[PDB]
Structure formats: structure tokens, C-alpha cells
Amino acid sequence: MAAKKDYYAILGVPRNATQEEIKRAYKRLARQYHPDVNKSPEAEEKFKEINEAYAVLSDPEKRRIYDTYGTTEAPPPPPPGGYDFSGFDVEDFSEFFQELFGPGLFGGFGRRSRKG
């Protein structure tokens, strides 16, 4: 329920956007925050968010995951390891991604207890 980042707002597309407008919405922003173009700590952070937004917005397959989940009440996500993230480095993205795909990225480390 880390409602601090609307993935659609980050790219500049509506909720029921077509994948056509989503992909070019990544491309436009990528060039602005690319380190060779713009080597600022103010850029690197947005460069995460646009790739984070597009990591979910790449397919309606992932868009529906964060749509049906993304609350505290939301059912437990699919078993760890069963996520595609190669060439994104999604473990470095923020809480809203780390609540959904993150438990699968880590696989549950620390050897911690849980409440129910």
C-alpha cells in the first residue's frame, strides 16, 4: 500500500493506457535521465522510477498484478524466483515494487518471524 508512486503518472499515461503510448513514455524520459546526457543524483532517482513504472507497465500481465494487489489486504504474491527482472535491477526500486515482486527477488532472507 506504498501509494507514493503512480506508475502511470511517472511515465505520463492514463490507467487504461495502450502499450504503444507506454513504451514511448519510457523512451522519452529515459533520454532525459540517462547518466551520459544528465549525470545528476537528481536524475539517477527518476531513472529508477521510469524503469520501475515500465517494469510493471511493459505488459497488462504485470499491470493487473499491481492493480489486484498493492494494498495491505492484497493476497500473498506468486512463489519467489518466479519473476522476470533481468536488465532492470528491480531489487533497487522502492517499497511499492518491493512489496509486490520484492519478496520474490529476495526469497525471504534474515530468518525472521511473522504475524498473522
Side-chain angles (χ1 to χ4, degrees):
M1 192 173 171
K4 306 160 184 176
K5 42 182 53 277
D6 294 304
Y7 294 140
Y8 298 101
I10 301 170
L11 293 185
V13 294
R15 297 295 180 167
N16 293 268
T18 182
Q19 305 296 148
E20 302 175 281
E21 69 184 279
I22 291 177
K23 61 187 297 169
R24 55 84 74 158
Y26 175 63
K27 269 61 182 59
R28 56 178 285 255
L29 299 176
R31 307 297 289 276
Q32 308 176 30
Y33 302 118
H34 260 301
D36 290 72
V37 173
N38 179 23
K39 50 276 292 299
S40 305
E42 299 178 84
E44 70 174 277
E45 52 179 273
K46 274 66 174 184
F47 194 72
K48 308 301 174 169
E49 305 183 285
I50 62 184
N51 193 33
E52 177 185 45
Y54 184 64
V56 181
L57 273 48
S58 180
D59 290 284
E61 316 303 288
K62 318 300 181 190
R63 293 170 65 191
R64 74 180 62 121
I65 260 66
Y66 115 93
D67 187 271
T68 192
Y69 299 136
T71 67
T72 308
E73 304 185 283
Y83 292 121
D84 55 284
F85 48 79
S86 183
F88 295 86
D89 302 287
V90 305
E91 57 191 85
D92 190 54
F93 298 161
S94 189
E95 306 159 290
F96 199 32
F97 204 104
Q98 301 299 273
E99 62 174 274
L100 253 308
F101 309 88
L105 265 286
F106 302 130
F109 66 104
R111 186 62 178 164
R112 308 300 181 215
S113 185
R114 63 188 301 177
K115 177 181 177 183

